[PDB]
Design a protein around this ligand. Structure first.
Ligand SMILES: Cc1ncc(COP(=O)(O)O)c(/C=N/[C@@H](CO)C(=O)O)c1O
Ligand SMILES: Nc1ccccc1O
Ligand SMILES: Nc1ccccc1O
Ligand SMILES: [Cl-]
Ligand SMILES: [Cl-]
Ligand SMILES: [Cl-]
Ligand SMILES: [Cl-]
Ligand SMILES: [Cl-]
Ligand SMILES: [Cl-]
Ligand SMILES: [Cl-]
Ligand SMILES: [Cl-]
Ligand SMILES: [Cl-]
Ligand SMILES: [Cl-]
Ligand SMILES: [Cl-]
Ligand SMILES: [Cl-]
Ligand SMILES: [Cs+]
Ligand SMILES: [Cs+]
Lengths: 253, 395
């Protein structure tokens, strides 16, 4: 989890927030996805949130549900995801890499084995979307044992008990789904908050930083560019370039 | 933080996104309150009796056990309003919704019985009902879909994923996480996240309570076993519950064997799946070696759930209940046998349970034994399927 520590200190020295794109690993294919991700980093992504294709992604809406479907139709397995992740880490030694998992994939081959494999390939953090704080202990413990940050979601309907829980057990960053809630997270020494779930234009990146968040995560908006350009890889990579550079530029203010 | 233990041993839990935890906590508190509230219990009993037709009969089979020392009773949930046991617990959950001030119902259904049950309960109690159903199921069960719409419910076909019960379950959860201030998610079996396995059992336990009183009245003793099919686990746990501390009474749950366990085309995760975490619970599942959820095949649509309630996995693990499987063809043979011998057309789901009682009596015909089969629904809905099968085989 050191990479998040290092990233946020660097961004603080540059007086910047973090811009973090999300994509589904293997969407639309393995080689395509690897090229997408390198274009994201090249265009100025500060960290990456990477989804592992899963049969029933509950917490995910329509655009990512189709990204998940495209990676499924490409035969991308968890094992191939681990191989992709190792290569991504080997290309990009400092960028923080966070996984978006569902509980059954983490549980499937042993929880501790899963986080051990994450450690081996260079993953920095794991958010398990269908594990609440109240169920998180075995995942948290396996994560920390393998130097993985456990990411907790701080939802809109959070209350003060949850804020204290999230601040106590989370590492790396807090996944923030308003101005008062960031205040309490800071007072509670929570991991720096990244706002997600709404970030689709530069104004929203600037808004999140202005609100006191450490940055913003953009999901659907990134994946929509992939869907919109599935027939033109060159156009896809060009639009991702322009979109990410713009969103990152917005985190300076 | 919960009032009740969310686990049955190693099984169960509340594996939902954080956004849904307040909805689950609200529901648990409302249930615990309702259980201590005589006014809730009176309204529930009033509905169960005067609207749904309880108590249901306990029928002694007259012909089917001829030539054996088995006595076989059928718990007649097929006579309940709606034609299946699903009606019991939707009435209780509908009252919980009203207790919580909710005016809308969200429901999932695969075969359509729980959807129809949700819709009729919402019509009676004045709740706006929306039902999610995999589009494949919507095409396959147009009669139950029409029943739901007749009763005013909105039926929402789900095309995501496999367009079956799994994806319907997921869509209902997405909706609830946004609407739970006014809507209640009426989960239709004894599975999913806590508190649902506990609530559905408690709102089905009148099955076994009645059976116990009736069998004592009629035979002067408890059954040697009570037998029930296991799709998600609600009719079985409803029959089992009041006998769990009567350790002389066998508890036998019957999963669908489909085309045969060795074919892989079955619905028997408790005995032939692998524990996983999905649909909010830690429980045995049909899954791939890579951890993707698979489908439950059965001739009977209602046994289509790819997992099982956590209390059944727990009761199995400790040896309190035994679980077996019954194939499509055995279930069909029991269906035909009950029709001809007792004048009762059983649901193909419950025909799996009858098939296992028939195996018990035929394998050991001089064994003296007192068996109760939970007849969890009537098989009117199945006669077109049975017709097309018998015709395909030139019968
Ligand atoms: C007539 C009948 N018998 C048994 C079961 C089995 O359900 P439990 O194990 O008792 O909970 C069902 C289930 N039906 C669900 C799934 O399709 C549904 O309607 O949506 C059923 O319709
Ligand atoms: N507010 C809240 C509190 C506890 C768990 C989940 C929550 O959303
Ligand atoms: N016959 C019937 C079947 C399902 C629901 C209500 C009904 O009256
Ligand atoms: Cl880097
Ligand atoms: Cl484990
Ligand atoms: Cl666990
Ligand atoms: Cl911390
Ligand atoms: Cl156990
Ligand atoms: Cl009481
Ligand atoms: Cl006995
Ligand atoms: Cl099926
Ligand atoms: Cl128990
Ligand atoms: Cl025991
Ligand atoms: Cl068969
Ligand atoms: Cl006909
Ligand atoms: Cs007999
Ligand atoms: Cs099943």
């Amino acid at each position: 989890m050191e990479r998040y520590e290092n990233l946020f200190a660097q961004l603080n020295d540059r007086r910047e927030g973090a811009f973090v794109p999300f994509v589904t690993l293997g969407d639309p294919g393995i080689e395509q996805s690897l090229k997408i991700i390198d274009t994201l980093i090249d265009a100025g992504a500060d960290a990456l949130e990477l989804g592992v294709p899963f049969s029933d992604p509950l917490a995910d809406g329509p655009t990512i549900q189709n990204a998940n479907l495209r990676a499924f139709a490409a035969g991308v397995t968890p094992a191939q995801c681990f191989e992709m992740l190792a290569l991504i880490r080997e290309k990009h030694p400092t960028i923080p890499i966070g996984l978006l998992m569902y509980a059954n994939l983490v549980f499937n081959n042993g929880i501790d084995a899963f986080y051990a494999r994450c450690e081996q390939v260079g993953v920095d953090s794991v958010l398990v979307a269908d594990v609440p704080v109240e169920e998180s202990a075995p995942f948290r413990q396996a994560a920390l044992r393998h130097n993985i940050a456990p990411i907790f979601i701080c939802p809109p309907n959070a209350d003060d008990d949850l804020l204290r829980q999230v601040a106590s057990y989370g590492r790396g960053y807090t996944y923030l789904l308003l101005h008062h809630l960031i205040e309490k997270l800071k007072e509670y020494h929570a991991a720096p908050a990244l706002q997600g779930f709404g970030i689709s234009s530069p104004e929203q990146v600037s808004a999140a930083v202005r609100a006191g968040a450490a940055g913003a995560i953009s999901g659907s908006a990134i994946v929509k560019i992939i869907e919109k350009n599935l027939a033109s890889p060159k156009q896809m990579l060009a639009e991702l370039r322009s979109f990410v550079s713009a969103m990152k530029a917005a985190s300076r203010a | 933080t919960t009032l009740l233990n969310p686990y049955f041993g190693e099984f169960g839990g509340m594996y939902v996104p954080q956004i849904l935890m307040p909805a689950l906590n609200q529901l648990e508190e409302a249930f615990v309150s309702a259980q201590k509230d005589p006014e809730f219990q009176a309204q529930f009993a009033d509905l169960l009796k005067n609207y749904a037709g309880r108590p249901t009969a306990l029928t002694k089979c007259q012909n089917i056990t001829a030539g054996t020392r088995t006595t076989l009773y059928l718990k007649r949930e097929d006579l309940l309003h709606g034609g299946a046991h699903k009606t019991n617990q939707v009435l209780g959950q509908a009252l919980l919704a009203k207790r919580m001030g909710k005016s809308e119902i969200i429901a999932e259904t695969g075969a359509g019985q729980h959807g129809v049950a949700s819709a009729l309960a919402s019509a009676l109690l004045g709740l706006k009902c929306r039902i999610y159903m995999g589009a494949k199921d919507v095409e396959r069960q147009s009669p139950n879909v029409f029943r739901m719409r007749l009763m005013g419910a909105e039926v929402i076909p789900v095309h995501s994923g496999s367009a079956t019960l799994k994806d319907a379950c997921n869509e209902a959860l997405r909706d609830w996480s946004g609407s739970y201030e006014t809507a209640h998610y009426m989960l239709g079996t004894a599975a999913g996240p806590h508190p649902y396995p506990t609530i559905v059992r408690e709102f089905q336990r009148m099955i076994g309570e009645e059976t116990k009183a009736q069998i004592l009245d009629k035979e002067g003793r408890l059954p040697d076993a009570v037998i029930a099919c296991v799709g998600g686990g609600s009719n079985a746990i409803g029959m089992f519950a009041d006998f769990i501390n009567d350790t002389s009474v066998g508890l036998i749950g019957v999963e669908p064997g489909g085309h045969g366990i060795e074919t892989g085309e079955h619905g028997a995760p408790l005995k032939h799946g692998r524990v996983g975490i999905y649909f909010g619970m830690k429980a045995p599942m049909m899954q791939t070696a890579d951890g993707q959820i698979e489908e439950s095949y059965s001739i009977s649509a209602g046994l289509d759930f790819p997992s099982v309630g956590p209390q059944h996995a727990y009761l199995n693990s400790i040896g309190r209940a035994d679980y077996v499987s019954i194939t499509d063809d055995e279930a069909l043979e029991a269906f035909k046998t009950l029709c001809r011998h007792e004048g009762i057309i059983p649901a193909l789901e419950s025909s799996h349970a009858l098939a296992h009682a028939l195996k018990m009596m035929r394998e050991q015909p001089e064994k003296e034994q007192l068996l109760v089969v939970n007849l969890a629904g009537r098989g009117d809905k199945d006669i077109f399927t049975v017709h097309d099968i018998l015709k395909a085989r030139g019968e």
